[PDB]
Amino acid sequence: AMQFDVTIEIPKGQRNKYEVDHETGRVRLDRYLYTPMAYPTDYGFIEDTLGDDGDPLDALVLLPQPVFPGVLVAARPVGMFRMVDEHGGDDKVLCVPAGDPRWDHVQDIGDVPAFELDAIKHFFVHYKDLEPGKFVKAADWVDRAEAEAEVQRSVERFKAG
Amino acid sequence: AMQFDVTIEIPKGQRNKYEVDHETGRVRLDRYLYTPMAYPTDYGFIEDTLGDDGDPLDALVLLPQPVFPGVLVAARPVGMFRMVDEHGGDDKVLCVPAGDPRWDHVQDIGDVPAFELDAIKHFFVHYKDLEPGKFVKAADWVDRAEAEAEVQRSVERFKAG
Amino acid sequence: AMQFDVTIEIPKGQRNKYEVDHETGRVRLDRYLYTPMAYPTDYGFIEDTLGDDGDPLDALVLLPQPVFPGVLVAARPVGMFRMVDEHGGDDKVLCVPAGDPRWDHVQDIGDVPAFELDAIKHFFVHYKDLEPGKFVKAADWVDRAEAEAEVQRSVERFKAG
Amino acid sequence: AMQFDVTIEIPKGQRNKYEVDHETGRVRLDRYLYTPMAYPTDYGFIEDTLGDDGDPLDALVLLPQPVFPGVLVAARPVGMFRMVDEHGGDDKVLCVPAGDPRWDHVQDIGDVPAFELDAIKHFFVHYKDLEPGKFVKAADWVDRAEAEAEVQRSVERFKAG
Amino acid sequence: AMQFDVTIEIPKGQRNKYEVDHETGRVRLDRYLYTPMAYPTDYGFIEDTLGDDGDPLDALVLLPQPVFPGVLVAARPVGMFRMVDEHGGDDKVLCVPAGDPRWDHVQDIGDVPAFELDAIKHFFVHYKDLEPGKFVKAADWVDRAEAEAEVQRSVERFKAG
Amino acid sequence: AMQFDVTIEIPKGQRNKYEVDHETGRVRLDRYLYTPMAYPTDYGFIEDTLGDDGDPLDALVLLPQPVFPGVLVAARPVGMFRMVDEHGGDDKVLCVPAGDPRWDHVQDIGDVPAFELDAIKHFFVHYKDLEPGKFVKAADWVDRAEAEAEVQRSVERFKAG
Ligand SMILES: c1ccc(-n2cccc2-c2nc(N3CC3)nc(N3CC3)n2)cc1
Ligand SMILES: c1ccc(-n2cccc2-c2nc(N3CC3)nc(N3CC3)n2)cc1
Ligand SMILES: c1ccc(-n2cccc2-c2nc(N3CC3)nc(N3CC3)n2)cc1
Ligand SMILES: c1ccc(-n2cccc2-c2nc(N3CC3)nc(N3CC3)n2)cc1
Ligand SMILES: c1ccc(-n2cccc2-c2nc(N3CC3)nc(N3CC3)n2)cc1
Ligand SMILES: c1ccc(-n2cccc2-c2nc(N3CC3)nc(N3CC3)n2)cc1
C-alpha cells in the first residue's frame, strides 16, 4: 500500500494560515483569515513532491487530536479534493494515519461520510470570500486511484531536479 | 446613555451553538455547527426583552477575551445587524462593554472597521449553508439610533406580560 | 425512539472530576484524579431519573467537541456500560446527540468501534487504581434494548417520589 | 479541623475578572484587567459568610488544575493575606482542598513556599496600577489561627441576618 | 515602506519565557516568570540584525491570534519602546503585520491607543520585580522614524561581520 | 552539580506521542495513544547521549507550565525511573529546571512526593495496555547517584562514535 510523510503546516481548528519556506524549512505565518472560518482538518504538504502547479502537493490528514506546525505524520491516501483557484491547480490529497488499525475501515472516498466531505469542501469554497481577486472553482472529490496517480507523478516530477 | 445586561450563550471562536432555556435558565447545547465556521464575537441575548420574533433580543458583544456560557456582561449598543431567516426577523444588536474607557471611541456603527462587520456578516450568511430548509436574507448593518429603538420597544413588549 | 436530556458534569479530556449537588443544582469539584488519566467521553447524568444505586442514572455522550459543566444535551441511547464498584451498581448509558443526522448510522452497540469501547472500559477499570479501598468489577458492554430498559425503570423509580 | 465551601469566581491564569451577583447567584464579568497580569491562584468567596467589609469573605484556593466559574470546592484554611484597598478591608483566606491527602503537609503559612506567597502578593499589589483612584496598602501574610478567627466571626456576622 | 521578518519567540499570554540559541536556531526555555504576569504581545527578534547591545534587535508584533515559537512573521514598524536594564540597552520595536490592509490605519505610535502602550510598558517595568539584581529604567515610547533608524543601523552592524 | 539539556518531545497533559528523528532533528507524530491517558510530566531525551538500549537517554522534567515539542530545557537529575519493555531497557531520568531557586529543595528522589512518583509509574505501566505485543516490567524508582551514573556512561558511549 502507498505511504508517505506529510509535514503538517496548519493544525485543525486554526484561523492562522501557516506556510513553510521550502528553501529554509522555517514555518511562516501567511495570514490571519479574513472570514470567520477554521481549518476543518490538519493541513500540510507531502515531503519530496512537486505538484501540478510547481509547488509541493498539499494534503489533508484526518487526526483524532491536532498536532503542531512542522510535525511529520506517516499517512496513506484515501481520496483527493480537486480544485482550481487563482494559483492554478491546487489539489489536496485526503489521508489517514498509516499503520494505525483504528483507521483500517477507511480505504476509499466512499468510506468517508458525506457531512465531513461537504464541510471540507465548504471551507475551501468560502474561506477567501472577503479577499479580493481570489476565487476557487471546479471543486470535486475523486477516489483513491486518482489520488495515488497524482502522488506518483508528483514524486517523478520532484526526482527530475 | 443606554445600558443593559447581556447573558452570553456562545463564546467567541466556538463551533458549539449553545442556547438558554428561558423557563429554567439552564444552558443547552443546540448543535455542533455543520459548516467549518467559528462564532466571530461573543453571542447572547439581552435580559428582560421580547424581540420582534417572540424570543429575547439577540446581542453581539465585542470582548478582548472570551467569557463562559451563562455569564452576564453590562453592555451598550453601537449599531445593529438586521436579518431575516426561517424563524422570521432575527436582528442582533452590536455592543461593547459599558463603563470601560478602552471602548469610548466606539460610539456608532461607523467607528467599527469594515473588515470586522464584513466578517460578522459572513458568518451569519454562511453558517447554515449545509443545513437543509434553513436560509438567511436581507442582511444589513444599521446605526445606533435604530438599535436603541429596537431595544426600547423590546423592553416595552416584555413589560406587557 | 427513546430520547432524554443529559446534564454534562465532566467534559472530555478532563482530569478534574465534577459532581452536581442534586439538592441545589450547583456544580462541585469532587477531586483531581490520582492517576494520569483523562475522561474519554463527556460524562453526566440523565435528568429526572433514579438509578439502581439510589443516585441518578449516569450517561456517556459521544460529542465532536466538548461542552462545559452543567450544560444540557438531548441524547439517545445506543448501549450501556455495566459495572459494579464500592458504591454498588454503577452503570453508564452510552449515548449520541438526538436529532443529529451525522450520528444516524450509530443505532446499537455493534455500530461503535471496539477501540473506543475498549478505551472507555480502560478508563473506568483503572482510574481509581491509586485510591485505597476503591475498586471496580463486572465490567461489561450491553446492547440498546438493555440500556432502554434501565432508563425506563429509573424514570419509574423517580416518579415514585 | 475547620472546613468550608468556596465558590470559585475566577480560574487561575485568567485576565477576566468575574464576580457573582449574590442576590441572583449569576456570574458576571466585572472587567478585563488593565494590566498584563493573570490571577495566580483560583479565586472566590466562602459561602454563607459576611466579612469585615460587608461583602462575603474572599478565598484563594491552591489547585493542581483550574476549575470553571461558579464551581464549589470543599477547602480548609492554611493562612490569610491581609490587605486594605479603596473598598476598605479586603482580606483573602489561603486554602487547600479538604479531604485530599496530597495537601496534608500544608497545614500553616510556613509550609507554603516564599516564591508562591511573593507572587500572590505581587498580583494584588500591582494589578490595579493602571486604574485611577484605586490602590492597595498594608499587604501582609498571617498564619492559620488568624485566618480561622476571621472565618469564625464572618459566619457569626452572616447568621445575624 | 520598511519591512522585515520577525522570528516570534514568545506567544501572547504566556508566562514561559523562550529564547532562541542563535548559533543553532533551537528554541530554549529561559525560565518560567517569577511574577504573575503574561506577555502582552507576541515577542521576538528581527532576523539578520545586531542591536545596540550586541544581541539581535527585539520586536513586539501586534497579532489578532497568537503564533507558536519559531514562526516567521513579515512585519513593519510603527514605533519603538526604549529601555535600559541590567544587560544595557534593550529596545523593542513595535510592529504590525506587513501587507495586511486591516492594520493600514496604524502607521505611527500616535495611532496605537494609550491603554495598550501603558500595558506593554507595565509588563517590562514589573515582570522582573521578584528577580534579585535585575531592574529596568529609562522606559520611553518613541515614534516610527526613531524605530526605522535603529533597524537601519542594526542591519549595518550585522553586515559588518 | 550535574547539568544537561533536555529536548522536550511531549508536553504534559498530551495524548499525542511525539518522537524526534535523530538524523534530521524533525518532530514526528508516533501515534495517538490507545488508552485514555495523558503524559504526567514533560517528556524528552538528553542531548548528546547514547543510552543502554542504543537510543538517546530519556528524561522526565517537572515544569510548572508545559512547553512545545522541540524546545530545549537546562535540567538537573534528582532520580531515575528504571523499567524494561519490548524495546529492552528504557530508563527515564527524573529532572527539575537547573539554575531555578524554586526547585532547590528537590535534590534527591526522597524529596519528590509519593503521589507524584506513583502517578508517573502508573502511566508507564498502563499506557500500552491496549497495544498487543507491548508490555512493561521491572518498574522501579532509584536515587540521584544511580541516575548520574547512567547519564555519565551514556555520554561516554556517545563520544565513542
Ligand atoms: C469514517 C471516517 C472518519 C470518521 N470520523 C469523523 C470524525 C472522526 C472520525 C473517526 N475517528 C476515529 N478515531 C481515531 C479516533 N476513527 C474513525 N474510524 C474509522 C472508524 N473515525 C468516521 C467514519
Ligand atoms: C474599533 C473597534 C474595534 C476594534 N477592534 C477590533 C479587534 C479588536 C478591537 C479593539 N479592541 C480593544 N480592546 C480591549 C482591548 N479596544 C479597541 N478600541 C476602541 C479602540 N478595539 C478596533 C477599532
Ligand atoms: C462510529 C461511532 C463513533 C465514531 N467516532 C469515533 C470518534 C469520532 C467518531 C464520529 N464522529 C462523528 N462526528 C460528529 C463529527 N460522526 C461519527 N459517525 C457515525 C459516522 N463518528 C466512529 C464510528
Ligand atoms: C507546598 C505548597 C504548595 C506547593 N506547590 C506549589 C505549586 C504546586 C504545589 C503543590 N501541588 C501539589 N499537587 C496536587 C498536585 N501538591 C503539593 N504538595 C504539598 C506537597 N504542592 C509546594 C509546596
Ligand atoms: C489601534 C491599534 C490596535 C488596536 N487593537 C487593540 C487590540 C486589538 C486591536 C486591533 N486589532 C485588529 N485586528 C486584526 C483584528 N485591527 C485593528 N485595527 C487598526 C484597526 N486593531 C486598536 C487600535
Ligand atoms: C516536591 C516536588 C514537586 C512538587 N510539586 C508537585 C507539583 C508541583 C510541584 C512544585 N512546583 C513548584 N513550582 C514552580 C512552581 N515548586 C515546587 N517546589 C520544590 C518546592 N514544587 C512538590 C514537592
- E16 vs F65, F74, F100: nearest CB: F65
- C15 vs D65, D71, D72: nearest CB: D65
> With contact defined as beta carbons under 8 Å apart, do D98 and D76 qualify?
yes
d(CA A24, nearest CA chain C) in Å: 36
> With contact defined as beta carbons under 8 Å apart, do E32 and E18 qualify?
no
C64 in contact with A at a CB cutoff of 8 Å? Answer: no
* Three-state secondary structure call for residue C25: coil
Reading the block at residue D16, the C-alpha cell is 477576566
Residue C130: CB atoms within 10 A of its CB come to 17
Residue with CA closest to ligand 2 atom 19: B103
> With contact defined as beta carbons under 8 Å apart, do C106 and C96 qualify?
yes
Query: Nearest Cα to C5, choosing from C64, C93, C81, C83?
Result: C93
d(CA A140, CA A142): 7
Q: Which fold has domain B1-161?
A: Inorganic Pyrophosphatase (3.90.80)
- C115 vs F15, F34, F38: nearest CB: F34
d(CA E134, CA E85): 7
d(CA E145, CA C27): 56
Which single residue is written with the C-alpha cell 534593550? E90
Q: In DSSP terms, which residues pair with B5 in a beta bridge?
A: B74
Instruction: Please report, in range form, the residues annotated as the binding site of F for Mg(2+).
Output: 9, 53, 58, 85, 90
> With contact defined as beta carbons under 8 Å apart, do B72 and B44 qualify?
no
d(CA E26, CA B36): 34
**Binding site membership of E64 for ligand 5 (Cβ less than 6 Å):** yes
DSSP annotation string for E29-61: EEEE-SSSB--SSEEEEETT---TTSSPPEEEE
What amino acid positions of B are annotated as catalytic residues? 90
Expressed in Å, this structure's resolution amounts to 2.7
d(CA C150, CA C79): 11
Which single residue is written with the C-alpha cell 451569519? B124
Q: What are phi and psi of D115, to 5 degrees?
A: -60, -35
Query: Nearest Cα to C61, choosing from C12, C101, C15, C25?
Result: C12
C-alpha torsion angle, residues C19, C23, C26, C30 (rounded to 10): -30
- Per CB-CB distance under 8 Å, the chain E contacts of A18 are 67, 71
Chain E from 99 to 138: CB within 8 A of any B CB: 101-102, 113, 115
The residue to mutate among B106, B112, B117, B120, having the most atoms of ligand 2 within 8 angstroms of its beta carbon, is: B106
Q: What are phi and psi of D71, to 5 degrees?
A: -80, 140
Cα–Cα distances in angstroms (integers) from residue F10 to residues A92, B23, F42, F73, F141, in the given order: 29, 47, 6, 13, 21
What letter would DSSP give residue D55? S
Task: Say which experimental method was used.
Answer: X-ray
d(CA D111, CA D97): 15
> With contact defined as beta carbons under 8 Å apart, do F51 and F88 qualify?
no
Q: What are phi and psi of D7, to 5 degrees?
A: -90, 115
> With contact defined as beta carbons under 8 Å apart, do B37 and B123 qualify?
yes
Q: What are phi and psi of C5, to 5 degrees?
A: -95, 125
Domains of chain C: which residue ranges?
A: 1-161
* Three-state secondary structure call for residue A115: helix
Contacts 24+ apart (CB under 8 A), D131-135: D131/D34, D133/D86, D134/D85, D134/D86, D135/D85, D135/D86
Which single residue is written with the C-alpha cell 528553501? A23
* Three-state secondary structure call for residue C85: strand
Residues recorded for chain F: 161
Q: How far is C-alpha F153 from the chain's CA centre?
A: 17
- Per CB-CB distance under 8 Å, the chain D contacts of E15 are 13, 38
d(CA A95, CA D53): 62
Which single residue is written with the C-alpha cell 406587557? B160
* Three-state secondary structure call for residue F150: helix
Reading the block at residue B53, the C-alpha cell is 420574533
Q: What are phi and psi of E155, to 5 degrees?
A: -70, -40
**Residues with Cβ within 8 Å of residue F46, at least 6 apart in sequence:** F4, F5, F6, F56, F57, F58, F59, F93, F151, F154
**Residues with Cβ within 8 Å of residue C113, at least 6 apart in sequence:** A102
d(CA B28, nearest CA chain C) in Å: 4
Does an interface of 3+ CB pairs under 8 Å exist between F and E? yes
Query: Nearest Cα to E138, choosing from E16, E52, E75, E36?
Result: E52
Instruction: Please report, in range form, the residues annotated as the binding site of F.
Output: 9, 17, 31, 43, 53, 58, 85, 90, 127
- Per CB-CB distance under 8 Å, the chain E contacts of F67 are 16, 18, 29
When computed from its CA atoms, the radius of gyration of chain C, rounded to whole angstroms, is 15
Residue with CA closest to ligand 6 atom 19: F103
**Residues with Cβ within 8 Å of residue B127, at least 6 apart in sequence:** B33, B35, B37
> With contact defined as beta carbons under 8 Å apart, do B119 and B37 qualify?
no
Beta strands in chain F (DSSP E): 4-10, 16-20, 27-32, 42-46, 58-61, 72-85, 92-97, 136-142
**Subunits close to D (at least 3 CB pairs below 8 A):** B, C, E, F
Strands A92-97 and A58-61: parallel
